Write a protein that binds this ligand. Structure first.
Ligand SMILES: O=C1CCCC2=C1C1(CCCCC1)N=C(Nc1nc3ccccc3o1)N2
Ligand SMILES: Cc1ccc(C)c(OC(=O)c2ccncc2)c1
Ligand SMILES: OC[C@H]1O[C@@H](O)[C@H](O)[C@@H](O)[C@H]1O
Length: 391
């Protein structure tokens, strides 16, 4: 009974009802954008590396209608949202630009509106709902940024590219939520497809849609139900650390750097600096193998790379925590688990376990009553990206 069921028809239903009640009318548009689990490729995106996320059935829905009066009126019904649940503001102009503040959940919608590249953007009324656990490491913020962006395209079609929309959503994250993220979470929330993982090349911005085509197996996502303080603080520190190496090795990005390179050039960089880049340059290689493992149906190599990916995160990148360490070591003990790791930024959030669909229900007995803290489970079919339903 720890396993949360998606209930996506219900989430749209609740969003419509709450719109009709709040604004006096049926909403004209529904949009959705999913949260994400990163199978492997941790802390590689911002080092121009490779990531292998898939989109979750956990999503953010905006239901809404254009206004004439050039203002934005928002209601969120998400339980975890900080108060107030409602915010109204005028559209930004040459004169007045939006600014982050209170409430925080609105900062994501403001940021996307502030950097939306097309015109003219009319005002709108919208209800915001999400089944993505808020700050639980499955990209609630990217799904609300991308759900917002998708709603704005219905108001004012952009004439742009998938990467342009990801960088808009990424800019809102940087400027309005003070989180200097890579492109992974936005890219996956835009481009996900049911029954596929998405290999992203964060140097070239090439993307591959890789079938998840053994249904014998599952990905179990485990919510540790913690966020440590160091989370917010440490993500940029790591990022600045990766960039100092790249300075010192005359590389424009760590991507360009290979493990033979870094071992021969230690003297050039810090002992921390060398171990930060040892993850990244290590990780990027492990992903490329994990992609090529997935296509060959080599579940057991992908598994083992995954554990390497955790051990590099835990020991070299130091962005795991005892709770994650303990959900991973606990998963890796269960026969038919190919692999387990922390996913996303770390310091709390979720693990992702690759295992047999028959073995998965053994785990949720076991994890719940052999996990120090409280487990929540998602059994994730790989899902669609950003979607529109005309109402
Ligand atoms: O405070 C933090 C720390 C950083 C991680 C982060 C949280 C909070 C920020 C604002 C409210 C409190 C939780 N929210 C999100 N994301 C998000 N808030 C949403 C609201 C409605 C719909 C979808 C949403 O996704 N991320
Ligand atoms: C990394 C990897 C390698 C191989 C396989 C078969 C993988 O899993 C799926 O194909 C799959 C996952 C979840 N739901 C359905 C299918 C994953
Ligand atoms: O794999 C680490 C990831 O951490 C995420 O939470 C962040 O939003 C991504 O851009 C990426 O840096």
């Amino acid at each position: 009974a720890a396993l949360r069921q998606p209930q996506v028809a219900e989430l749209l239903a609740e969003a419509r009802r709450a719109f009709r009640e709040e604004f006096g009318a049926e909403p004209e548009l529904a949009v959705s954008a999913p949260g994400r689990v990163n199978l492997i490729g941790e802390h590689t995106d911002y080092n121009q590396g490779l990531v292998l996320p898939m989109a979750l059935e956990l999503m953010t829905v905006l239901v809404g209608s254009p206004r004439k009066d050039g203002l934005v009126s928002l209601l969120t019904t998400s339980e975890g949202a900080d108060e107030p649940q409602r915010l109204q503001f005028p559209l930004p102009t040459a004169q007045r630009s939006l600014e982050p503040g209170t409430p925080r959940w609105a900062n994501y919608v403001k940021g996307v509106i502030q950097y939306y590249p097309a015109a003219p953007l009319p005002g709108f009324s919208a209800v915001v709902v999400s089944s993505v656990p808020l700050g639980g490491g499955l990209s609630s913020s990217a799904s609300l940024e991308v759900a917002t962006y998708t709603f704005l395209q219905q108001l004012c079609p952009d004439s742009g590219t998938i990467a342009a929309r990801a960088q808009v959503c990424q800019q809102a994250e940087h400027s309005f939520a003070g989180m200097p993220c890579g492109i992974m979470d936005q890219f996956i929330s835009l481009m996900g497809q049911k029954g596929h993982a998405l290999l992203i090349d964060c140097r070239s911005l090439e993307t591959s849609l890789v079938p998840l085509s053994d249904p014998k197996l599952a990905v179990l996502i485990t919510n540790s139900n913690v966020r440590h303080s160091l989370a917010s603080s440490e993500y940029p520190v790591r990022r600045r650390q990766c960039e100092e190496v790249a300075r010192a090795l005359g590389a424009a990005s760590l991507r360009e750097v290979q493990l033979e390179e870094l071992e021969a050039a230690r003297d050039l960089v810090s002992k921390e600096g060398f171990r930060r880049a040892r993850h990244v340059v290590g990780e990027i290689r492990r992903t490329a193998q994990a992609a090529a493992a997935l296509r060959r149906g080599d579940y057991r190599a992908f598994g083992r790379l995954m554990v390497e990916s955790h051990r590099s995160l835990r020991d070299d990148y130091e962005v795991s925590c005892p709770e994650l360490d303990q959900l991973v070591e606990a998963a890796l003990a269960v026969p038919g688990v190919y692999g387990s790791r922390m996913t996303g930024g770390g310091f709390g959030g979720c693990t992702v376990t690759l295992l047999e669909a028959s073995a998965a229900p053994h785990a949720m007995r076991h994890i719940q009553e052999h996990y120090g803290g409280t487990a929540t489970f998602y059994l994730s079919q790989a899902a669609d990206g950003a979607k529109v339903l005309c109402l």
